């Protein structure tokens, strides 16, 4: 299953596992 | 944090000599378009070999020697992945095959098994 949007420190998305 | 830096291989199995593969490194922690990288494999016992690079942003791609014309490695931006097509595939090219990134400091993927037969 390709990348989904993935919550960082800094409350933004950055590509990761799903 | 080099913590959140992660390579996943994926797309590894068994496949007729002359067959196809298409391995999957997905990676997180850092964007792939930035970020030369590079496929290696390793046979047990043998020593580790280079298989292929992509260079950051339009720098291109390199191959190593046994596999110019049989493999083809590309980079999605968006999905953050690097892909090793792999075609006509010998028995020779069995291995594991990890993606790695970094200069100064490397991070590495586990790899994913491939084996090729030989058939009838």
């Known amino acids: 299953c390709g990348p989904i949007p993935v919550l960082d420190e800094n409350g933004l998305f950055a590509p990761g596992p799903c | 944090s080099s913590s959140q830096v992660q390579l996943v291989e994926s797309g590894g199995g068994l496949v007729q000599a002359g067959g196809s593969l298409r391995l999957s490194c997905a990676a997180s922690?850092?964007?792939?378009?930035?970020?030369?990288m590079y496929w290696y494999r390793q046979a047990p016992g043998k020593e580790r070999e280079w298989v292929a690079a992509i260079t950051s942003q339009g720098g291109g791609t390199e191959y190593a020697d046994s596999v110019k014309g049989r493999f083809t490695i590309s980079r999605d931006n968006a999905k953050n992945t690097v892909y090793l097509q792999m075609n006509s595939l010998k028995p020779e090219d069995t291995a594991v095959y990890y993606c790695?990134?970094?200069?100064?400091?490397?991070?590495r993927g586990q790899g994913t098994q491939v084996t090729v037969s030989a058939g009838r």
């Open positions: 790695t990134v970094g200069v100064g400091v490397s991070y």
């Open positions: 922690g850092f964007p792939v378009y930035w970020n030369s």
